[PDB]
Amino acid sequence: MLKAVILIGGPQKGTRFRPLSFEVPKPLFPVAGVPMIQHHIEACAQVPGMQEILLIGFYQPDEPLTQFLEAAQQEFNLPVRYLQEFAPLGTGGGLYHFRDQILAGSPEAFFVLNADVCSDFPLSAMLEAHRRQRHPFLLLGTTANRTQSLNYGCIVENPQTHEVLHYVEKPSTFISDIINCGIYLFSPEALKPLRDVFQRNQQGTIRLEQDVFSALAGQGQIYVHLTDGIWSQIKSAGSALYASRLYLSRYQDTHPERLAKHTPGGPWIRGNVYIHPTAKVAPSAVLGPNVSIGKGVTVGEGVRLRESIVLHGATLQEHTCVLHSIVGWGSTVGRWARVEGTPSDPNPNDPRARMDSESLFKDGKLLPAITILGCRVRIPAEVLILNSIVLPHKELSRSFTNQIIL
Amino acid sequence: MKALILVGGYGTRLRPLTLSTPKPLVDFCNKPILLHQVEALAAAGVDHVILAVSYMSQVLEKEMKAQEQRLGIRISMSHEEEPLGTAGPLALARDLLSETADPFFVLNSDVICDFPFQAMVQFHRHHGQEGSILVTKVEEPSKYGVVVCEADTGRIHRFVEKPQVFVSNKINAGMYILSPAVLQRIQLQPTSIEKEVFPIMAKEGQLYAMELQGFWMDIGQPKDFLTGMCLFLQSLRQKQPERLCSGPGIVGNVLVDPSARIGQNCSIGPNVSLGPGVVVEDGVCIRRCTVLRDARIRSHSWLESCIVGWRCRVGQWVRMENVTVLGEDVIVNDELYLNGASVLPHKSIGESVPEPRIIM
Ligand SMILES: Nc1nc2c(ncn2[C@@H]2O[C@H](COP(=O)(O)OP(=O)(O)OP(=O)(O)O)[C@@H](O)[C@H]2O)c(=O)[nH]1
Ligand SMILES: Nc1nc2c(ncn2[C@@H]2O[C@H](COP(=O)(O)OP(=O)(O)OP(=O)(O)O)[C@@H](O)[C@H]2O)c(=O)[nH]1
């Protein structure tokens, strides 16, 4: 028997996702058409012997979260429960606080997945490596650039036994090119160190990386499993576009019916395109590489869509060019309008990928990044929105370049 | 009665158009500007004009000799091997203007207006002195040199290059009537006439000033080219309104050459002049743009305030705003954005230009 614990965040963790996280929680944001933790629930339900999927977070249970829970329980034939913490307890404090609900039924192991990662999720390879070695902590790690590794949690390991000897969460110097993927496999024995950490706080909030991983490294309890699959961290609102690109590439092997094909009565399609069946796309439109369309989306004639996410209810009128953008829920773009962003991907292999701070700014200047329209944003006709963030329920009247429209 | 026209001498403004064809030979509302000047000139009744050219301009020779045949008036060709400026042209063709003691027009090339030639002649005969200038109103006195006018005579007192004093509203309009004694004063050297020769005969007070009523623009500048194209389509709307093309997807004052093609389902907005042989495709919005001849604008593009050069190929979903002048044979790739891009001829653009800069 196996279990899966998906550590979704809370409303404070979604503030960096801010113009999209104003209407729906950041875990329920659709990357490549389905919500971002439905990829985790998909991959965990594919593992044989998986009995339960628990979601630990401090979101209050509202209608989108409970509707997603019912839909996931019906779709994947598995109990998907939401354990709500009484306070933000960190990444390890929710695992220690819900230890009786996690260890109920005595599982052999339980996965611990951070909800903001986009991975190919090699849970079966990781599980079998654990079934051979049977250590308390198993980490998923991937190789990164030497400049990019200072953004992520570096893992210094011994290559013979694959045992991590050092862990630094954000080192100022290069210590390792292997970074932590946010996918873990825990033995039941792994809830025994967390307790000790909790007792050291009493002589509540446990950070799993700083208090458990960095402190127990080199003592034979934490081990690494290295993969070469796709991996990304969805932190800001524009990172979901790169995660969408990766997931649409993954759909060529995983869900080939989800990608859209060339149809004689349909639109032109380049690259990997997801179109929802409820969405009505005009045949004169062309939908370029890495485009996701949601339900009830009207796409007019002559619409160019490239590297974009169009959320549900949005309307693009005729001859509208949308590049590197996220078009919010119910937000309408008028005719001959151009919604353009500059490509900015958070990949740990690109040397001049960006350094991914909380600040969207530099020297007063807003950095050129993905154009994000919030929900119910009205873009007028023949108006350019370039490199801009538009907050929800905004009606614009002129062109805006490199701004944050409050 | 004769007329000298000042042309050639490489217009440094609107330089992406000037680099291919000369500045009097680029098309202003499906017609070259020198054609406009000499057609209104021949409607005045001047039997021969002289145009004075320092740049070697063989296609200007070509078109001008063909239009000698077309118009019925003679055209004389004063050829200049150094730049003589704008007074030196009067002194190089000075014996042809000393043939007959009768006052002659001197015209600048870059000016478009409604040309009041016989009223100018009536005014020059009324005031009875050496030189008559044309003046106009400009709202912006901090850009051009001002000229002081007393009422009911129109005599100059002084001529001021510099702005920012507010001694006058009136600006030089690029039209002069000069007597042969003025040309007697002009010397062979490359001096310009309005810097020195007009100042001294304004100091003696020989110079008089005649006022236009409306619609003047010098189009030596690309933004002034587009503003003068707007004003010319205004004047064309309330002078010959059946010459502008009307339609269901046509807004405002739009001039379309009969060789031009406009696709289905596209909105040609106000103040647009499409040249001969232009192919506007399906779903293109064009407002305030001047598209010169043989240029093809592909589908779903958007164009506001732009000068599209000869034999251009604007791609699909291209947005062009902020007076981006394309030169001759410029190929803009699909899904680009140009803002202020003065693009030199024979260029291929594959990157968006987000702020005004020159592409070479
Ligand atoms: N339940 C719960 N989950 C949390 C909490 N804080 C963060 N998380 C989740 O834990 C995951 C990682 O949290 P972070 O603190 O941002 O860590 P990280 O920056 O992604 O670093 P790595 O895990 O090393 O890749 C995310 O999915 C968060 O949503 C919390 O207080 N409670
Ligand atoms: N033929 C001759 N024509 C000249 C010469 N210099 C200037 N011109 C003409 O003088 C007229 C008025 O001068 P400008 O208004 O300054 O025009 P421009 O010489 O084209 O200079 P810009 O328009 O600022 O580029 C123009 O029609 C020119 O063609 C010259 O050296 N030789």
| Chain-centroid distance, C-alpha B73 | 22
CA pair distance A13, A15, nearest whole angstrom: 6
CA torsion sign for B60, B62, B66, B69 is positive
CB neighbour class for B55 (10 Å; exposed up to 12, middle 13-18, buried from 19)? middle
Burial of B276 (0-12, 13-18, 19+ CB in 10 A): middle
Chains A and B: how many Cβ contacts under 8 Å?
Answer: 38
β partners of residue A81:
A54
Residue B215 touches chain A, beta carbons under 8 Å: no
Q: Obtained via which technique?
A: cryo-EM
Resolution in units of Å = 3.1
CB contact under 8 A, B335 and A401: no
| Ranges of H-type helices in A203-286 | 239-250
Q: Which residues contact B55 (CB under 8 A, 6 or more apart)?
A: B8, B9, B10, B22
Q: Please answer whether residues B74 and B48 qualify as being in contact, where contact means their C-beta atoms are separated by less than 8 angstroms.
A: yes
Q: Determine if residue B164 is left, alpha or beta; phi over 0 gives left, psi from -120 to 50 gives alpha, anything else beta.
A: left
Q: Hey, is the C-beta of B304 within 8 angstroms of any chain A C-beta? A: yes
- Residue B57 phi/psi, 5° resolution? -130, 85
Longest dimension (CA), chain B: 63
State whether the Cα torsion A297-A300-A301-A306 is positive or negative. negative
Q: Which of B304, B317, B352 sits opposite A304 (nearest CB)?
A: B317
- Residues A102, A130: Cα–Cα separation, whole Å: 18
Tell the burial category of B342 from Cβ atoms under 10 Å away from its Cβ (0-12, 13-18, 19+). buried
A270: left (phi over 0), alpha (psi -120 to 50) or beta: beta
- Looking at CATH, the fold of the domain delimited by A2-233 is given as Spore Coat Polysaccharide Biosynthesis Protein SpsA; Chain A (3.90.550)
Backbone angles phi, psi at B286, to 5 degrees: -125, 120
The amino acid occupying position B31 is K
Indicate the SS3 state at residue B166. coil
Q: Which two tokens stand for residue B219?
A: 């189009």
Is B222-349 a CATH 2.160.10.10 domain?
yes
- The 3-state DSSP class for residue A321 equals strand
B305 vs B288: CA distance, rounded Å: 5
CA distances from residue B240 to B90, B225, B289 in whole angstroms, order as listed: 36, 21, 21
Exposure on the CB side of residue A248, measured as CA atoms within 13 A: 27
Query: Where do the domains of chain A lie?
Result: 2-233, 238-401
Give B218: exposed, middle or buried? Use CB within 10 Å, 0-12, 13-18, 19+.
buried
Backbone conformation region of residue A200, classed left if phi is above 0, alpha if psi is from -120 to 50, else beta? alpha
Three-state DSSP state, B304:
strand
CB-CB contact of B341 with B356 (8 Å): yes
Report domain A238-401's class: mainly beta
Nearest to B335 among A301, A302, A304 (CB): A304
Q: Do B2-218 and B222-349 come out as alike in CATH topology? A: no
Rounded Cα–Cα distance for residues B273 and B19 (Å): 21
Residue linked to tokens 């039924």: A105
Q: Whose CA is nearest to atom 15 of ligand 1?
A: A91
Residue B150 φ/ψ, nearest 5 degrees: -95, 145
For residue A136, the distance in angstroms to the closest alpha carbon of chain B comes to: 53
Contact yes or no for A319 and B354 at CB 8 A: no
Report the distance separating Cα A334 and Cα A274, nearest Å. Answer: 23
Q: Which whole-number Å values give the CA distances from A146 to A165, A180, A183, A346, in the listed order?
A: 19, 14, 21, 15
Taking CB atoms and an 8 Å limit, are B354 and A336 in contact across chains?
no
Residues in chain A, overall count: 406
The answer to whether the Cα torsion of B319, B324, B325, B326 is positive or negative is negative
> Is the CB of residue B190 less than 8 Å from the CB of residue B91?
no
| Domain spans in chain B, listed from the N-terminal domain onward | 2-218, 222-349
CA distance A211 to A197: 7
Letter for the amino acid at B5? I
In B152-213, where does DSSP find H-type helix?
180-185, 198-203
Distance, CA of A118 to CA of A231 (rounded, Å): 5
B283 contacts chain A (CB < 8 A): yes
Q: B319 near A384, Cβ under 8 Å?
A: yes
Name the residue in chain A with its Cα closest to that of B300.
A319
Tell me the pairing of strands A280-281 and B296-297. Answer: unpaired
Name chain A contacts of B251, Cβ cutoff 8 Å.
Answer: none
Taking the C-alpha atoms of residue A56 and residue B123, their distance in angstroms, rounded to an integer, is: 92
Query: Is the Cα dihedral A380, A381, A384, A385 positive or negative?
Result: positive
Q: How far is the CA of B171 from the centre of ligand 2 (A)?
A: 18
Q: What is the DSSP letter of B266?
A: -
Q: Which ligand is nearest to the CA of B25?
A: 2
| CA angle (A81, A13, A240) in 5-degree steps | 90
- Topology of domain B2-218 in CATH is Spore Coat Polysaccharide Biosynthesis Protein SpsA; Chain A (3.90.550)
**Looking at the annotation, which residues of B are catalytic?**
162
What does the alpha-carbon distance between residue A399 and residue A397 come to, in Å, rounded to a whole number?
A: 7
Q: Are B50 and B57 in contact (CB under 8 A)?
A: no
Q: CA angle, B216 as apex, B212 and B221 as ends, to 5°?
A: 150
Report d(CA A75, CA A60) in Å as an integer. Answer: 23
Tell me which of B281, B300, B338, B339 to substitute to probe the interface with A (most A C-beta atoms closer than 10 Å): B300
Dist. CA A182 → ligand 1 center (Å):
8
Q: Are B344 and B358 in contact (CB under 8 A)?
A: yes
In the numeric block, which tokens belong to residue A126?
């990781």
B335 and chain A in contact, CB less than 8 A: yes
Our answer on whether the CB atom of B136 is closer than 6 Å to any ligand 2 atom is: no
Least distant ligand from the CA of B85: 2
Residue B57 and residue A166: Cα distance in Å, rounded? 78
- Cβ–Cβ under 8 Å, residues B356 and B322: yes
Rounded-to-integer distance, Cα B320 and Cα B287, Å:
11
Which chain B residues contact residue A317 at CB under 8 A? none
B156-160 vs B111-113, strand pairing mode:
unpaired
Distance from CA of B71 to the nearest CA of A (A): 44
- B152 a known binding residue? no
Please state, in angstroms and rounded to a whole number, the distance separating the CA atoms of residues A257 and A223.
Answer: 37
DSSP single-letter state for residue A151? G
How many other CB atoms are there within 10 angstroms of residue A294's CB atom? 20
